Amino acid sequence: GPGTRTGRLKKPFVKVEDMSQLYRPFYLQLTNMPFINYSIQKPCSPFDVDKKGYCECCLQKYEDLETHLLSEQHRNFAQSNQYQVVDDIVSKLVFDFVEYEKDTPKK
């Protein structure tokens, strides 16, 4: 069992393993294996039984998107030259919308 890390999986289970045996298997154990339910009314699935993330610029997990975006590290990346690859594509598109002058308050 758990102490020796040796034993057998409680059933039901699914086990997947790469045939090279280079990698850890991965397992699924659930109380009930899937059952096709034809009685549940369409469009429900026949299997129906019923701001956190990673910043790719900073290479950092965050728990609140808005908070991360205001951080000093993220602001420095946002204002850097790292977006030249985007601007290079944009410069080949054609702008065909009407652009208005800014409205200034009067009196």
Binding site: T6, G7, R8, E17, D18, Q21, R24, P25
Partner: peptide
Amino acid sequence: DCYATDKVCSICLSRRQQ
């Protein structure tokens, strides 16, 4: 020896993840 069986052991459990 766990390959293609319901077994687990310290060898296969301790491998890196694909």
